[PDB]
Model the fold of this input.
Amino acid sequence: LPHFSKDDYSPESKGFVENSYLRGLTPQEFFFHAMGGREGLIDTAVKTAETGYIQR
Amino acid sequence: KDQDDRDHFGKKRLDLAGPLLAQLFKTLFKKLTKDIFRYMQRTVEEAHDFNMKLAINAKTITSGLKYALATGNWGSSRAGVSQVLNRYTYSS
Amino acid sequence: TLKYICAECSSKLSLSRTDAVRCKDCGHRILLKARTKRLVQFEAR
Amino acid sequence: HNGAPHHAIEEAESLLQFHVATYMDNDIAGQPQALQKSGRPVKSIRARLKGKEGRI
Amino acid sequence: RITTLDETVGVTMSHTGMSMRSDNSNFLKVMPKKEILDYLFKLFDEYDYWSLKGLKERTRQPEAHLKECLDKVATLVKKGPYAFKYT
Amino acid sequence: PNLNIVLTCPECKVYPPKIVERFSEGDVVCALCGLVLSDKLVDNEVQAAFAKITMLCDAAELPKIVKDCAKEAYKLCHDEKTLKGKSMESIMAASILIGCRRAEVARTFKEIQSLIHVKTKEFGKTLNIMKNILRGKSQNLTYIPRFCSHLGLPMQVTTSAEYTAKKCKEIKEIAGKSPITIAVVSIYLNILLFQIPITAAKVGQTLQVTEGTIKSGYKILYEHRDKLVDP
DNA sequence: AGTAGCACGCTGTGTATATAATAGTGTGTTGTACAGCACAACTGCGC
DNA sequence: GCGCAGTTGTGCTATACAACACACTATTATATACACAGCGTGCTACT
Ligand SMILES: [Zn+2]
Ligand SMILES: [Zn+2]
Done:
C-alpha cells in the first residue's frame, strides 16, 4: 500500500492482521482482509459453477 | 523489470457520459455529413432542387441517440451501458 | 360528461368526450381524474 | 427457363443453397448469418434443438 | 464555449419545421426546306461533324424534322469524341 | 369449405353456446350444466414510395400517426388509372396533406409547398382527384394555436384568438378570403389588444403574410371590435 | 425651395371551371454495348 | 512418398447511354374571387 516504504517485508506490511474482530482493525489491515474475502467469494462462485457441470 | 501488470488501476480509464456521447455523436455526425453529400450529388447530377430541410434529416441524429440510450447498445461493440435507475431506496 | 382536474392550476374542468385532452385556462395536458364522490370504507386494523 | 447468363444462374443457385443452408443451420462458421428484418439472427431448426432450453 | 439560445423557443422551432418561408437564398437552384437542306449540306462539306442542335440553331426547325432528312444524307457516329454527330 | 368450429354442450343443447372461458384453468365451460367444453387453451414501387415518404414526414416531424394515415392513403391510390400521372411528387404531397387532415392536424398548402415543389395548381387538381377516390372507396381553428407557437405567445392570447376566429366566421363579411388571412389577422388583433409588441412587418415576414393584407384585414376587423370581446 | 426617399394605393397576373384546336418537344423505357480453453485435424517441409 | 511437427480450426463453457415511342402542354374566351406583388405617384423631411 502507499503507506509503507519500499521493500518492507514485515508481516504488518504484507498483510498479517493482528487485531481480533472484537478490537477492530486498522485501515490498512481492513483493506487486506477485504482482499482475502474477495478471493473467497470469487473462487466460491467458480467452484460452484464448475462443479455442477461435472455433476452433469 | 517485472512483467507489466495488466490490472494496475492507474492504467485503466473510466468513461462517463461525456466520452460515450462523444464517440456515438461522432459516428452519427459523420453519417449525417455523408448523407448531405449524397443529396448534393443527387441534385447536382440530376439538376433538380436544393432545399435545406430535405438535405438535413433530423431523425438521423435524434432517433439515433434516443435509440441508443433506449437499448444501451453502442454499435454489438458494447451493451448494457444504459440502465434504468434504481429508486428502491435513496441509498440504492 | 365526467369531472377532471388540471395538473397545475387544479381547476375543475369536467370536459366531455371528443374534447381531446387539454386544460382550459392553461396548456397542461395532464388531467387528474377527480376522486370519487361516494363513500369508501376502511377497517382501522 | 430463359435468359440465362450462366453467371446469373451460378449466383442464383448459390443463393438457393445459402437460404436452404441457413434454414437448417444458421451458425455455420465463416458464412454470413441470415438476419431477420429486426436485426436479430434467424433462429434455425438447429438453434431450436441445440442448446439448453432447446427441445431436447 | 457554447451559447444557449434563451428565446421563447417557439420562434426557433417555427423556423425549424415547415415555416411557410421559402427561397430567400439560392444554392444549386439549377429559309424553306429547299434552301435549308442545301445550306445544311454546305455545312456538311464545311464540317465533317455537326449536331442537330447546331442544325436546329441554323434552320430554326425542330430537331425531329432535322433528324429525318439527315438520316438520308448523313449517318450518325455514337462513339468517339465526335459521338452523337452526323458525318 | 365449412371448417368453422363451434362449441356446443351435448347435454344442454337448449341454446347455441352460452359459455364462459376460464383462462387460469385454461379451459372453457358451459355456464349452465357446468361442463367443460375445451381444455388446454393455448395462449418495389411501394417500398420506394414509403421510403421517400418516410423521409419527408420525418423531416416534417409529423407524429407517426399522421405518417401512417398518409401511408395508408397512398396505398389505396397506388397505381390506379384516374391518377394517370403526377410523377410521384404530387402524390406524396397530396397523400401527406390528406393524412394531416384525417389526423386532425393541420398543415397549410404553403408549408407542404415548402417541403416539396409541386407547382401549386397542378397540386390542387391531384388533391381533388385523390379526394374523390377516397370517397369512392367508401376548419381553420387548429391553425390558430400553431401560429402562436411561431410567435411564442401566451396561452390567453391563443384562446383569445380562438374566440376571435369563431366570432369572425359567424359575422361573415368577406367570408375569409382563405382561412390563412383570417387566422393571422385574428392574431394581430388579439396581440394588439395586449401590450406585447410584434409590430407588423415582423409578423408579416415571420408568418409569410403580406403586410398590406394584415392591415387590410385589420380595418374590417377593427370595425367589428364591439362584439369580439370575451370578457 | 428642391430633391430624394418611403409609403400607400391601384392595376395586373397567379389560382380555378369548361371547352376545341394541333402541333412538335420532352420524358421514360427498353435494348445494346462495353467494362478463453483444450483438443482435434490438415498441410507443409524435410528426410 | 511418408512421417512428423508446426499451424489452423472447432465444439463447449451450472450499368450506362442512346434511340424510339408515346403523351402532353402551350393558347383563347367568361363569369367569379381572391390574392399577391410590383410600380407609380404623392407627401414629408432634410439639406
Ligand atoms: Zn389548468
Ligand atoms: Zn351445458
Chain B touches chain E through nine residues (CB under 8 Å). The helical segments of chain B are 17-46, 52-55, 58-71.
